[PDB]
Amino acid sequence: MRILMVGLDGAGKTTVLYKLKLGEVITTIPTIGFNVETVQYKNISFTVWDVGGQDRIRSLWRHYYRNTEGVIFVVDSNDRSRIGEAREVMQRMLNEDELRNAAWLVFANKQDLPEAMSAAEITEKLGLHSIRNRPWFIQATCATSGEGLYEGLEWLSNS
Amino acid sequence: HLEKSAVLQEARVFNETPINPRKCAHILTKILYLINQGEHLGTTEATEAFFAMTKLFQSNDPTLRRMCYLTIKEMSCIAEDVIIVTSSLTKDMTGKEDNYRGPAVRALCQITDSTMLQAVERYMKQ
Amino acid sequence: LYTVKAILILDNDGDRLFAKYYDDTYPSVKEQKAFEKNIFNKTHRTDSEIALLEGLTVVYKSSIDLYFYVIGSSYENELMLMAVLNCLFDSLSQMLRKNVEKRALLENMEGLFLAVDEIVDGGVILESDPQQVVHRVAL
Amino acid sequence: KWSCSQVFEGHTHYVMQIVINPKDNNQFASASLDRTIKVWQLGSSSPNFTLEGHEKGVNCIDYYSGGDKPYLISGADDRLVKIWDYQNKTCVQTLEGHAQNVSCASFHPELPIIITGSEDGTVRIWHSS
C-alpha cells in the first residue's frame, strides 16, 4: 500500500513516521524534501512518503500525488492560527485528479498538549463532513506516545 | 542506437510508485547512451525524468547509484526542481565503499550551489 | 588542475562509438564527432604513443577495430598521457569482461560510460589505476 | 519527600552513569555496560530510542552542552571514547582515549576538547577538531 503523508510544517509528520518505523521518538529537523520508508503492520507493507510542509516544499507535493492509495494529513491540534491554512491546503488537495480515489486519513496530532483542539473541533474546521466522494476518517494522535498511530494504520488498511 | 524521446518518456514511471532498480538503471543507461552516441535531450521529458529519478535514490544498489550520478549531472541543466536530489546524494555519500563515496561527491557538488554548500561540508571533510 | 582534454574511443573511421568530453569545448554532437574524426585522421595508420594534433599531444593506441584516445597538453609528453590511455584500455577490458573492441563496448555500454568517468573528471585525472576503477564501478 | 515518581526499565545491565540533556531536561541518557546508551524520556518508562554507542559496554554518557548541541559521548573499556551525534545518529569520530580502558569520558563545553580518564592513572585531553 502506497501512502502520502503531508501537512503543514511542524505538524509532526516525520515524528510520526519514525515512531512507526523505529518505535523511537527522534529529534527532527525540518524536512526540506521527503523521507520515504516502509512500515509493516498486520501483513501490509505501507510505503510512506513524508513530504516536508514548509512553503517551498509544499509547492512540490503534486509530484507525489500519482499512485497514492491513501493520504495521511497531519494537523497540529495546538496551533489555531494555522488551522484555516491547513483547511485551504487540504481542500484543493481534495480537488486533485491523481488523489481522486485515495483514502483520506486526518491525524489531529499533539493531542497531548493541554489546549489541543479536539478531533471533533478539527473535523468542523477542516470541513471533513463535506467529503462524499471517498473514504475519510479522523483520528486523534500523539506521535510521541504513539497514541492513535496504529488505529490509523488499521483504518487505512481497510480502504 | 536509441531514440531520446522514448527513453526520456518511460523514465516518468519512477515518479509514481514503481522504483524497480533493474528497469530504472537500464533506462538511465539508455540516457547516458543517448548523450554518448550523440543526441540531444528534449527539455519537457528531461525535466520529468529528473524529478522521477530522485525516487530511485531510496534503493541503494551500487550499479543503480552509479547510473544515478552520471545521469543527474548530464540531465541537471536540462531539468527543473533538481534541489530534491541533494539529500539523497548526502545519504549515498556517507555510505562507505568507494562506489558511493567518490562518485556521489562529484555528482552532489556539481548540483550543489552556495545555499546547499553548507550541507555537504561534513561529508566532504571526511 | 588539468591534464586530459578529452577521451575518445573510436571505431576505425573516427566516428563516435564513444567520447566523453573532459573539455567543455565539445558538448554538441556535430562538433564532438568532428573532433573525433580529426584526431582519428592524424593519429591513425601510424601507431605510436605520440601524435601532435591541434598543438596538443594526443596519445593513442589501437585494437582490432578501435583506436583509443587521451588528448592532453603538449607541455607534457606521451608517457603521462599514456598512463591515462593505459588505464582507459585496461579498465574497460577488465570491466566489460572482454578486451576493448567495438563489440565489447556495445556489449556493455553502461560499463564503458561509468568506467571512463572514473578515469577522468572534468579534465583532471581522477583515476589511473585500472583495478581501482573496475572495483569502483558496478556493471 | 522522595517518593518514586517514575521507574525506568530499559537497561539490561549495570547503569554506570546518568546525565540530563540540556535541550530537554525531560530527556536524559543513561549509560549501561550493555554497549548502548539509551535516551529516555521521563514520561516513558522505556527508552524511547537506543543508541549503540560503544562496543565493550558504556561507562559514561554526557551531552555536549548548549541550546544547539545534540551530542552524546560513550566511553568504554575497549580503551576508547566515541563521539556520537544524536541528531544524525551516526558516530562522528573515535577517540583514542587512553592506552587502557577508558573509565569515563566527557565533553568540555567551552573549549573544543574531550577530557577522558582511564584506570592507567592517566587523563588525556583531545582536540575535538
From Swiss-Prot, chain A:
Gene source species: Saccharomyces cerevisiae (strain ATCC 204508 / S288c) (Baker's yeast)
Main location: Golgi
Amino-acid positions noted as binding GTP in the UniProt annotation, renumbered to this chain: 8-15, 31, 53, 109-112, 143-144
Role: GTP-binding protein involved in Golgi vesicle trafficking. May modulate vesicle budding and uncoating within the Golgi apparatus. May recruit the lipid transfer protein VPS13 to Golgi membranes. Recruits polyadenylate-binding protein PAB1 to COPI vesicles, and this is required for correct localization of the asymmetrically distributed ASH1 mRNA.
UniProt entry tagged with the keyword Aminoacyl-tRNA synthetase: no
PROSITE patterns membership: ARF
Example GO biological process: intracellular protein transport
InterPro entries linked to this entry: Arf1-5-like, P-loop_NTPase, Small_GTP-bd, Small_GTPase_ARF, Small_GTPase_ARF/SAR
Disruption phenotype: Increases phosphatidylserine levels in the outer leaflet of the cell membrane. Simultaneous knockout of DRS2 results in inviability.
Protein name: ADP-ribosylation factor 1
GO cellular component, as recorded: cytoplasm; cytosol; Golgi apparatus; organelle membrane contact site; plasma membrane
Miscellaneous information on this protein: Present with 19300 molecules/cell in log phase SD medium.
Record keywords, A-Z: ER-Golgi transport, Golgi apparatus, GTP-binding, Hydrolase, Isopeptide bond, Lipoprotein, Myristate, Nucleotide-binding, Protein transport, Transport, Ubl conjugation
UniProtKB/Swiss-Prot annotation, chain B:
Top-rank taxon, per record: Eukaryota
Locations listed in the record: Cytoplasm, Cytosol; Golgi apparatus membrane; Cytoplasmic vesicle, COPI-coated vesicle membrane
Intervals holding HEAT repeats: 44-81
Segments traversing the membrane: none
Family: Belongs to the COPG family.
Biological function: The coatomer is a cytosolic protein complex that binds to dilysine motifs and reversibly associates with Golgi non-clathrin-coated vesicles, which further mediate biosynthetic protein transport from the ER, via the Golgi up to the trans Golgi network. Coatomer complex is required for budding from Golgi membranes, and is essential for the retrograde Golgi-to-ER transport of dilysine-tagged proteins.
Quaternary structure annotation from Swiss-Prot or TrEMBL: Oligomeric complex that consists of at least the alpha, beta, beta', gamma, delta, epsilon and zeta subunits. Interacts with ZNF289/ARFGAP2 through its C-terminal appendage domain. Interacts with EGFR upon EGF treatment; interaction is essential for regulation of EGF-dependent nuclear transport of EGFR by retrograde trafficking from the Golgi to the ER. The coatomer interacts with KDEL receptors; the interaction is important for retrograde trafficking of KDEL-bearing proteins from the Golgi to the endoplasmic reticulum. Interacts with COPB1. Interacts with TMED10 (via C-terminus).
Protein name, entry field: Coatomer subunit gamma-1
Species this chain originates from: Mus musculus
Lineage: Eukaryota, Metazoa, Chordata, Craniata, Vertebrata
Swiss-Prot record, chain C:
Superkingdom, taxonomy of origin: Eukaryota
Keyword Membrane appears in the UniProt entry: yes
Broad class of the protein's primary localization: cytoplasm
GO biological process: intra-Golgi vesicle-mediated transport; intracellular protein transport; retrograde vesicle-mediated transport, Golgi to endoplasmic reticulum
Topology of the protein relative to the lipid bilayer: Peripheral membrane protein
Annotated keywords: Acetylation, Cytoplasm, Cytoplasmic vesicle, ER-Golgi transport, Golgi apparatus, Membrane, Protein transport, Transport
One GO CC term on file: Golgi membrane
Subcellular location: Cytoplasm; Golgi apparatus membrane; Cytoplasmic vesicle, COPI-coated vesicle membrane
Keyword Protease in record: no
Entry similarity comment: Belongs to the adaptor complexes small subunit family.
Subunit structure: Oligomeric complex that consists of at least the alpha, beta, beta', gamma, delta, epsilon and zeta subunits.
Function (record text): The coatomer is a cytosolic protein complex that binds to dilysine motifs and reversibly associates with Golgi non-clathrin-coated vesicles, which further mediate biosynthetic protein transport from the ER, via the Golgi up to the trans Golgi network. Coatomer complex is required for budding from Golgi membranes, and is essential for the retrograde Golgi-to-ER transport of dilysine-tagged proteins. The zeta subunit may be involved in regulating the coat assembly and, hence, the rate of biosynthetic protein transport due to its association-dissociation properties with the coatomer complex.
Protein name: Coatomer subunit zeta-1
Annotated source species: Mus musculus (Mouse)
Gene name linked to the record: Copz1
Range within the parent protein: 10 to 148 of 177
UniProtKB/Swiss-Prot annotation, chain D:
Name of the molecule in the record: Coatomer subunit beta'
Organism name: Mus musculus (Mouse)
Free-text function comment from the UniProt entry: The coatomer is a cytosolic protein complex that binds to dilysine motifs and reversibly associates with Golgi non-clathrin-coated vesicles, which further mediate biosynthetic protein transport from the ER, via the Golgi up to the trans Golgi network. Coatomer complex is required for budding from Golgi membranes, and is essential for the retrograde Golgi-to-ER transport of dilysine-tagged proteins.
Deletion phenotype: The knockout of the gene results in early embryonic lethality with no viable embryos recovered at 12.5 dpc.
Subunit structure: Oligomeric complex that consists of at least the alpha, beta, beta', gamma, delta, epsilon and zeta subunits. Probably interacts with PEX11A. Interacts with SCYL1. Interacts with JAGN1.
WD repeats: 10-50, 53-94, 97-129
Intracellular or extracellular location(s): Cytoplasm, Cytosol; Golgi apparatus membrane; Cytoplasmic vesicle, COPI-coated vesicle membrane
Family: Belongs to the WD repeat COPB2 family.
